Structure 1
Amino acid sequence: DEVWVVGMGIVMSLIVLAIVFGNVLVITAIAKFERLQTVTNYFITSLACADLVMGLAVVPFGAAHILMKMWTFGNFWCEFWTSIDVLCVTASIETLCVIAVDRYFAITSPFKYQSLLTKNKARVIILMVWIVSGLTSFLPIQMHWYRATHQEAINCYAEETCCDFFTNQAYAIASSIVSFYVPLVIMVFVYSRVFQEAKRQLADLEDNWETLNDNLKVIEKADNAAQVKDALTKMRAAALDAQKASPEMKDFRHGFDILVGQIDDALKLANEGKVKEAQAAAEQLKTTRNAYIQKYLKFCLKEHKALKTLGIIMGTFTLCWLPFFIVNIVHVIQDNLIRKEVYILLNWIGYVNSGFNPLIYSRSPDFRIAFQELL
Structure 2
Amino acid sequence: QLFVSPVVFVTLGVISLLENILVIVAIAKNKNLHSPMYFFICSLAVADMLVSVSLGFETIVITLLNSTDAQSFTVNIDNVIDSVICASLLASICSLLSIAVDRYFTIFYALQYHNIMTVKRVGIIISCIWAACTVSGILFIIYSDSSAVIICLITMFFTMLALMASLYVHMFLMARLHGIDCSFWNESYLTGSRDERKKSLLSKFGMDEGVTFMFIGRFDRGQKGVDVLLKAIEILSSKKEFQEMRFIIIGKGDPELEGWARSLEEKHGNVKVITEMLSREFVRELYGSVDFVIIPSYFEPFGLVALEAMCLGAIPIASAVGGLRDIITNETGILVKAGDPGELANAILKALELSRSDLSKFRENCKKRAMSFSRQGANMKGAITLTILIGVFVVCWAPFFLHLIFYISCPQNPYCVCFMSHFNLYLILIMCNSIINPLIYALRSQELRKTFKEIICCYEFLEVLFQG
The TM tier, using the shorter chain, reads: 0.5 to 0.7
Moved more, 303-312 or 81-90: 303-312
The answer on 1:240 being equivalent to 2:320 is no
Letter in 1 for 2:37: T
Partner of 2:114, secondary structure, is coil
Residue 181 of structure 1 is matched in structure 2 by 158
**C-alpha contact 1:100 1:191 (8 A) present in aligned 2:** no
Residue 292 of structure 1 is matched in structure 2 by none
**C-alpha contact 1:97 1:184 (8 A) present in aligned 2:** no
Could you tell me which of 411, 436, 440 is aligned with 1:356?
A: 436
User: Highest Rg: 1 or 2?
Assistant: 2
Q: How does 1:170-249 map to 2 (within 5 A)?
A: 170-177=148-155, 179-186=156-163, 189=166, 202-203=179-180, 208-209=185-186, 213=189, 234-235=288-289, 237=291, 239-241=312-314
In proportion to residue count, which structure has more strand? 2
Shift of 1:215: 7.3
In proportion to residue count, which structure has more helix? 1
Q: How does 1:54-93 map to 2 (within 5 A)?
A: 54-62=51-59, 64-65=61-62, 69=66, 74-93=74-93
Residues in 2 aligned to 1:174 and 1:33: alpha-carbon distance in whole angstroms: 38
Residue 269 of structure 1 is matched in structure 2 by none
User: What's the C-alpha RMSD, in Å, of the aligned pairs?
Assistant: 4.3
Letter in 2 for 1:309: T
TM-score by length of 2: 0.54
Shift of 1:130: 1.4
Structure 2: stretches of 5+ with no match in the other structure: 213-284, 292-309, 316-330, 333-359, 362-370, 457-468
Residue 169 of structure 1 is matched in structure 2 by 147
Residues in 2 aligned to 1:303 and 1:36: alpha-carbon distance in whole angstroms: 15
The answer on 1:334 being equivalent to 2:413 is no
Residue 132 of structure 2 is matched in structure 1 by 132
Q: How many residues align?
A: 299
Shift of 1:300: 1.5
**C-alpha contact 1:202 1:300 (8 A) present in aligned 2:** no
Aligned-residue identity in percent: 25
Check 1:345–1:79 CA distance in 2 against 1; reply closer, same or farther (3 A cut).
same
CA offsets 1:249-289 (integer angstroms, 9 cap, x no match): xxxxxxxxxxx79xxxxxxxxxxxxxxxxxxxxxxxxxxxx
Residues in 2 aligned to 1:28 and 1:39: alpha-carbon distance in whole angstroms: 16
Residue 146 of structure 1 is matched in structure 2 by 144
Residues in 2 aligned to 1:320 and 1:71: alpha-carbon distance in whole angstroms: 34
**C-alpha contact 1:58 1:84 (8 A) present in aligned 2:** no
Residues in 2 aligned to 1:189 and 1:198: alpha-carbon distance in whole angstroms: 12
**C-alpha contact 2:44 2:95 (8 A) present in aligned 1:** yes
**C-alpha contact 1:215 1:235 (8 A) present in aligned 2:** no
Letter in 2 for 1:174: C
Shift of 1:234: 3.4
Residues in 2 aligned to 1:188 and 1:233: alpha-carbon distance in whole angstroms: 35
Higher-RCO chain (CA-CA 8 Å, sequence separation at least 6) = 1
Residues in 2 aligned to 1:313 and 1:235: alpha-carbon distance in whole angstroms: 43
Residues in 2 aligned to 1:308 and 1:320: alpha-carbon distance in whole angstroms: 18
Check 1:298–1:19 CA distance in 2 against 1; reply closer, same or farther (3 A cut).
same
Moved more, 314-323 or 54-63: 54-63
Structure 1: stretches of 5+ with no match in the other structure: 148-167, 246-259, 262-294
